[PDB]
Design an enzyme around this catalytic site. Sequence first.
Site, PDB file in Angstrom:
ATOM      1  N   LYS A   1     -17.967 -57.255 -24.886  1.00  0.00           N
ATOM      2  CA  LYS A   1     -18.826 -58.089 -26.341  1.00  0.00           C
ATOM      3  C   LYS A   1     -20.008 -58.421 -26.352  1.00  0.00           C
ATOM      4  O   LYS A   1     -19.910 -59.605 -26.403  1.00  0.00           O
ATOM      5  CB  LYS A   1     -17.573 -58.535 -27.422  1.00  0.00           C
ATOM      6  CG  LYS A   1     -17.617 -57.511 -28.242  1.00  0.00           C
ATOM      7  CD  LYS A   1     -16.350 -58.308 -29.248  1.00  0.00           C
ATOM      8  CE  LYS A   1     -16.475 -58.791 -31.236  1.00  0.00           C
ATOM      9  NZ  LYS A   1     -16.118 -59.639 -31.799  1.00  0.00           N
TER      10      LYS A   1
ATOM     11  N   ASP B   1     -10.037 -59.705 -41.539  1.00  0.00           N
ATOM     12  CA  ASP B   1     -10.866 -59.011 -41.342  1.00  0.00           C
ATOM     13  C   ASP B   1      -9.486 -57.536 -41.391  1.00  0.00           C
ATOM     14  O   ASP B   1      -9.464 -57.208 -40.134  1.00  0.00           O
ATOM     15  CB  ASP B   1     -12.017 -58.632 -40.618  1.00  0.00           C
ATOM     16  CG  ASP B   1     -12.840 -57.264 -40.857  1.00  0.00           C
ATOM     17  OD1 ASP B   1     -12.589 -56.181 -41.923  1.00  0.00           O
ATOM     18  OD2 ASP B   1     -13.287 -57.136 -39.987  1.00  0.00           O
TER      19      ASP B   1
HETATM   20  O1  TXQ Z   1     -10.980 -53.446 -26.929  1.00  0.00           O
HETATM   21  C1  TXQ Z   1     -11.444 -53.342 -27.439  1.00  0.00           C
HETATM   22  C2  TXQ Z   1     -12.284 -55.593 -28.512  1.00  0.00           C
HETATM   23  C3  TXQ Z   1     -11.621 -56.438 -27.938  1.00  0.00           C
HETATM   24  C4  TXQ Z   1     -11.562 -57.435 -28.722  1.00  0.00           C
HETATM   25  C5  TXQ Z   1     -12.707 -57.110 -29.366  1.00  0.00           C
HETATM   26  O2  TXQ Z   1     -13.287 -59.033 -30.291  1.00  0.00           O
HETATM   27  C6  TXQ Z   1     -13.070 -56.190 -30.069  1.00  0.00           C
HETATM   28  O3  TXQ Z   1     -14.225 -56.900 -31.051  1.00  0.00           O
HETATM   29  C7  TXQ Z   1     -12.722 -55.219 -29.708  1.00  0.00           C
HETATM   30  C8  TXQ Z   1     -13.754 -53.995 -30.031  1.00  0.00           C
HETATM   31  O4  TXQ Z   1     -14.598 -53.922 -31.218  1.00  0.00           O
HETATM   32  C9  TXQ Z   1     -13.283 -52.823 -29.307  1.00  0.00           C
HETATM   33  C10 TXQ Z   1     -13.941 -51.354 -29.467  1.00  0.00           C
HETATM   34  O5  TXQ Z   1     -14.888 -52.059 -31.098  1.00  0.00           O
HETATM   35  C11 TXQ Z   1     -13.623 -50.052 -28.889  1.00  0.00           C
HETATM   36  C12 TXQ Z   1     -12.519 -50.214 -27.803  1.00  0.00           C
HETATM   37  C13 TXQ Z   1     -12.218 -51.102 -27.460  1.00  0.00           C
HETATM   38  O6  TXQ Z   1     -11.260 -51.688 -26.461  1.00  0.00           O
HETATM   39  C14 TXQ Z   1     -12.300 -52.454 -28.093  1.00  0.00           C
END
Ligand code: TXQ
EC number: 2.7.11.1
Length: 327
Positions: free
Chosen positions: A66, A154
């Site tokens: 991220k 959230d």
């Molecule tokens: O794993 C995360 C993920 C893991 C930790 C986070 O803080 C996060 O925002 C995400 C995330 O936004 C996300 C996503 O938008 C689409 C697929 C994903 O696997 C993730």
Amino acid sequence: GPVPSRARVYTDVNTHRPREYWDYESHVVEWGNQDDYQLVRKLGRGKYSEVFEAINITNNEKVVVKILKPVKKKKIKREIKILENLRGGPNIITLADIVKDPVSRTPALVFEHVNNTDFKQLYQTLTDYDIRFYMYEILKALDYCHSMGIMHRDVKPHNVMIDHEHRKLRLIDWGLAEFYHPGQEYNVRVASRYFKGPELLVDYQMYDYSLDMWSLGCMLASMIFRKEPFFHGHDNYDQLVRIAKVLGTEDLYDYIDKYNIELDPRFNDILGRHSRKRWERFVHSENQHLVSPEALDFLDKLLRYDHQSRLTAREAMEHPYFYTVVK
Ligand SMILES: O=C1c2ccc(O)c(O)c2C(=O)c2c(O)ccc(O)c21
């Protein structure tokens, strides 16, 4: 002016902690090696970051990266410190590393990989038993973070990643999360519209962990009734109207009156007078296999106007709703 409020659980957890724990502004980031990670595909872009599937070439493990957008600088160490404090907790996404991205010139957060199936697709599929199972798993995450002095702020389907094959769940996106300090006034511009608590929607700033339980309630209603989202307002004002159509206007007045809060006068020509409805009103042939007296009673106890009256995460895990779920 407004009557103050405090959390009825974990009220003083940060006041007895060493300063290091909650004073995220003082945090020194430990940077790893940006070369260890290779971006594979873009998964999403949010308000505040861009998210990638990546591979960690030192273990060939799949990870998620991220890369923060360079805006609201304070949010950044807040999120890092929250993720470090909660690491290892039940169903909390694991921050594996932090590196400096050389293109964006911002931090890139590296997390354990989760293989989610899409909430819209996956909600179409959940059985009664699976809604209960997954609700318990989320409650584990929420009680953990609440007991550590943090509110997520959230909670919504997009932030609850599920690998339905392995029956595994992770609460992600801690970028809005905050430390709970008794008597602190917080920003009411948190959570997404359909999941904002009545406290936000009436501009009441001295809220707490119980905000997350309102959001969890909205997710539950959406699943057991098969209506996404359950409270479907056009904007933040209509959002409160849609809530008042189910909860009723008398209990809304009772709430604002308790905290000596006034609604925005813009509510005068839009709010009306509404009775509180029985939850059975929302049951029909297409959702009835997901509904039971225990489900309706648990929902009724999450979706209260009064943040102080809602079930705590701990109390929710005690509820008869979960008696059928294998421990
Ligand atoms: O794993 C995360 C993920 C893991 C930790 C986070 O803080 C996060 O925002 C995400 C995330 O936004 C996300 C996503 O938008 C689409 C697929 C994903 O696997 C993730």
